[PDB]
Each structure stands twice: as structure tokens, then as C-alpha cells.
Amino acid sequence: TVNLGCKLDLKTIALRARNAEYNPKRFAAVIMRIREPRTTALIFSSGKMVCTGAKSEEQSRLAARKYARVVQKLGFPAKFLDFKIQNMVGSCDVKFPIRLEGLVLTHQQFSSYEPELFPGLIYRMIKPRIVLLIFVSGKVVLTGAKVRAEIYEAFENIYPILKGFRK
DNA sequence: GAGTGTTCGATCGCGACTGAGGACGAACGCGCCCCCACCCCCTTTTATAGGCGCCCTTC
């Protein structure tokens, strides 16, 4: 997310934009998209914006910066004030099946799973405060990160354990 | 002689006295609607897997 440093009129923005959507009856912000960034932006009336879809923090920064220019180019005093990363998402495959029953048993304090709920096991690591999603096929997803290393780190801690839980 | 005026007794009207009944109200009572307070609710992307609804076709 980033602040454009000014209050804006989304109605005008929606009107001007060639590739954005807005509906106050659905949400108070303009939804804008770009084919170059392929993430989508959320333009609050407050001037706050959200960048999504980006594969990297820079690309998020690049798109958000790219988003901030055109809003300015609409006629607004947009800025790049207070830019920050809000979330990062990662994924990987351990390439081997594991006995979740043992895993949810041995790490109930952190690991969490319910086959009646969702097919993926939810691991909430606190070390670097990371959440992992662990699936019967061995696929894993990590999110809630603001640092890429934490995904690598959270995964470095969890993979050996998983190997120790090989079927 | 005779006629008129006054007062206690007696007689009658009055109101006081006591209770019950009817109507009224005020304290008590009931509940809704008002509002502030506290905190959820909505959206996207990216990844995944289980369950699943609807349609198309065939019976």
C-alpha cells in the first residue's frame, strides 16, 4: 500500500480511466487494473492505494509507482508517500506425501488441520510469524510475509520436519 | 273592666354525627424506542484441494 498524499474524486477517476471499475454501492474505492503490472490497484477516496498481483516487492513498488503517475496524470497531486509492503505469498512442493495425522498430533500447538473443514493443513509459525498451508499431495503455501527471506526461513525450518513425516 | 305586650313551655325545624358506597387519582408498574458504545463487514491476489451445482445429453 501507498498514499498519494491527496484526497481524490473516484467518480472523476472512474470516468477518466480507460481500464478501471467503480461502484460505491459495492465498495468505496476505485478498482483499477494494468496489463503491465497484472496486480490490480485499490484507490481509496482518502488517497491510499493498494497494489496486488505483483510477483515481487519491487514489481509491487513499480506498479504502485506506475499507478501513482497516471492518477497524477489525471490531474491530481498524487504522491509516493509512505510506500510499504503489506503481504507476500509463496508456494512450493516437497515432492513427497506426509502423514498429517502425526503432524497435527505432534505439533498441535502450531500445526492445525481439519479434513471436514479444508483439505490443507494450516501451520501458523511464530518464529518469523508465518502461516503455512500443507496439503496431502505435499504442496505447501506460505503467506502473511513482508519479507521474502522469512518464506525461505519458515520453509527451511519446516521441510526437514516434513521429511521426518514421510509416508 | 278591657285590651295589648312579654317569656318559659312546648312543639317543630334544623343540622351535626357516623358509616357505607361510588368515583376519583397517584404511586406503582410495563415496555418500547431512543442512543451511545464496541466491533465486525466488504475486496483482491496468489496457491490448492475438496465438495458441489447446473447443464447437456440420453433414456
Side-chain angles (χ1 to χ4, degrees):
Chain A
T1 53
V2 73
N3 170 15
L4 299 179
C6 57
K7 301 291 176 185
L8 303 178
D9 180 73
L10 280 42
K11 311 184 312 302
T12 299
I13 297 168
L15 182 61
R16 284 193 161 123
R18 290 172 65 81
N19 288 117
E21 301 106 334
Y22 180 69
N23 195 346
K25 295 177 66 75
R26 186 181 180 277
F27 192 64
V30 158
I31 307 172
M32 184 174 179
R33 300 212 149 57
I34 62 180
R35 302 179 68 176
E36 301 259 275
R38 289 240 211 246
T39 38
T40 299
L42 302 178
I43 306 89
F44 300 148
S45 307
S46 69
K48 295 301 174 57
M49 175 175 63
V50 197
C51 182
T52 62
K55 302 291 176 188
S56 72
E57 55 272 55
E58 191 186 352
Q59 188 182 165
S60 192
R61 189 168 58 205
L62 175 59
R65 282 199 291 239
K66 278 176 173 302
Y67 280 109
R69 216 279 111 160
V70 296
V71 168
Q72 192 194 66
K73 196 180 178 183
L74 307 190
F76 301 143
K79 301 185 181 186
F80 191 69
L81 310 180
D82 202 13
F83 178 79
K84 61 184 66 188
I85 310 302
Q86 299 295 90
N87 190 27
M88 314 174 80
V89 185
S91 73
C92 45
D93 175 359
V94 304
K95 306 300 303 170
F96 57 83
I98 55 176
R99 295 186 296 274
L100 295 187
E101 353 314 64
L103 176 56
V104 71
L105 176 61
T106 312
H107 298 94
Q108 185 66 49
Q109 297 74 21
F110 295 96
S111 304
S112 186
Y113 179 67
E114 185 54 42
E116 206 194 342
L117 175 65
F118 183 73
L121 180 151
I122 311 90
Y123 192 80
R124 194 194 288 301
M125 199 176 291
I126 62 169
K127 260 325 81 226
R129 246 334 244 121
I130 293 296
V131 204
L132 305 88
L133 268 67
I134 294 156
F135 301 87
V136 292
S137 59
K139 295 193 185 188
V140 182
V141 179
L142 301 93
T143 180
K146 288 180 176 58
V147 178
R148 177 178 286 258
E150 302 170 347
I151 301 290
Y152 294 178
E153 181 173 35
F155 188 67
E156 189 169 4
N157 279 271
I158 216 81
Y159 200 106
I161 304 169
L162 263 66
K163 189 72 183 292
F165 286 156
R166 182 54 177 87
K167 296 191 185 183

